[PDB]
Symmetry: D2
Subunit: 186 residues, 4 copies
Amino acid sequence: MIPDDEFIKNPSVPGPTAMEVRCLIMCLAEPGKNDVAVDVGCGTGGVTLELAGRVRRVYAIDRNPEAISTTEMNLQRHGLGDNVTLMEGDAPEALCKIPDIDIAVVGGSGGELQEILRIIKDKLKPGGRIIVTAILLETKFEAMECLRDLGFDVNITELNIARGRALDRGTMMVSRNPVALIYTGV
Amino acid sequence: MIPDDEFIKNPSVPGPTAMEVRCLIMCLAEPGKNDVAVDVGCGTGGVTLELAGRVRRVYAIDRNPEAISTTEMNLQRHGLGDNVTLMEGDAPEALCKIPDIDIAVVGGSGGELQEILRIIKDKLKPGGRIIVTAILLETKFEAMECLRDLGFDVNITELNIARGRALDRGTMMVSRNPVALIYTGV
Amino acid sequence: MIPDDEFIKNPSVPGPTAMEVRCLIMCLAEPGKNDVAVDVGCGTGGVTLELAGRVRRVYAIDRNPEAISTTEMNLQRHGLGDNVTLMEGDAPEALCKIPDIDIAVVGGSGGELQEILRIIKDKLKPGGRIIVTAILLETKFEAMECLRDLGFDVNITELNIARGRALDRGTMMVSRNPVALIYTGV
Amino acid sequence: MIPDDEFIKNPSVPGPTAMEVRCLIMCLAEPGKNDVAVDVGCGTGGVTLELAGRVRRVYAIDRNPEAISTTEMNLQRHGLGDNVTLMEGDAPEALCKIPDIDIAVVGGSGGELQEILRIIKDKLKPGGRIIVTAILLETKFEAMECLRDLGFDVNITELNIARGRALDRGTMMVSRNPVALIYTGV
């Protein structure tokens, strides 16, 4: 997996998602080379990158132009992007212009989460997977609720990662903020 | 990834390792189809399974006969095992009968961790990766120390996972015990 | 603090709350010998005990008879209870029969959390503190939301505790499930 | 408890210790108004503060002059310090100039942890308590080992705290680095 260090950040663009989380999302999404995926709120490009290398097509969406810019840069740094359709603008509008999906990774809460999820449920091919990355306590709840309301079997996994930082004095554990992955049964 | 639920457990055999951890081990190990791997202390077979599907050869070792038995069963349930050499008995003895390795996943502390690590360092192909799964606070330290003494750049990641369990009353977060992954730089 | 071990458990009654959590609730609640406190959903009696020894009066409420029973037993084992009014039945009904409070520790989600909180806000003496112990992901959200809606400054602290268990092989870290303490500014 | 916010920090002086940890240390230490306590490596003064208000005497030690300086300031901001003997210099040297102790809170690993612990064991009144705050993975192990070697019953509790930070977008959980408290049975 591309570690967080090899990502070109941008002060106004959140990310990249911790490799440990990207790790897990990849396993939950269980990409197939014929799967069409959508990464809503692609940020620095973390998930898009990982998906780019394992699925047929990836539609990366984000309101923030700098994010599409950063994701673009990062795809190029890692020579991916041939199969990645970057998309500027409002997630719900963008999502309508997309084909049906097998995998949906929704990071960007962007308020309109419930709307995005409804849209996604409608474009989800049978056996599709939705994975919502929640940073805000509200998103954890809202995602759980929507997914259940859209008739999905919802699961949730909260990841608390700590990496050691070598100091002269020794190895200190440094925490990433908790990240929850709300995902629908396959 | 095969979820913990699809594993055939055995009351006397610990495991399977949380999918979230197996997930991360897979990313840290970064299996190559030409990589030879060894899973010391294969338990229920979790890591062996994951590795089986991504590397050339996997040598699964474990003192406990029931573990070799359970891993054997689980390999079959998931149609893997063709490239998995199961091995009974003392890990250091078994390890000497193995070819050089690219990836080493050492779970089974089995006391003799330091000895296993020494053996492994000697059979580690250049650019090889060692990942020690530590359940015991002592193994976290002992592994860090050996790895550093054997001249490796040691890193550590503690994973605290919680999965929601749906109750009538609502979703409750249930913790897995902390698991640390001590790993050598690639 | 009375450690979890010295509590008389009851298979049908959840608790006691990890000493680490009780410890923190005690500090957030900042009991004063003249403070009147209410422990909604007193379970095994953990918080009731701690409060009993530091405040003027403690009203312990719980739907479950076994819990009032168990809390009663534990109060006696530790010679407290002189200043503890145990209360059987529905929390909202019981809460109305109570005097105004300085401290409110709400553990028992019991569905009716929002109602309990509204009742509590109305009986909260100026400078009072509310602390809701959340086990369920929904309660974390719901409590945050209510407290904010009732005009409180809401804070949240998620505790992930792990205690070592000495085995022959060594000390192993054992996790308690995550517990969140949603509390109102003083 | 004095929250982390009301502490006068100093860029070169680590601390204050998270209120959640200070909270727990106070409970494990179980101060008595007649207890003599020593805070080795007093940092910003967190523990010293808490102890100051509950025990007879507190000897605060720290190599770093800025730390004794900052602790000094903080004691004054909170009108404590009348019963606090600040001490400059090498912890082992300072420790010999102290009377016997009931409570010892050792934060400052300062390398010489094992030496400090031996000294403390010798000055520990019967039924005394030692609590070592470990930030470094090495200290967790070393403390456990010494305490056991000095014939103490050693216990350990790893605390992973996350506090919500209110953003416009919502509440986000922010982690403190893991902190372990190794403590001797009373």
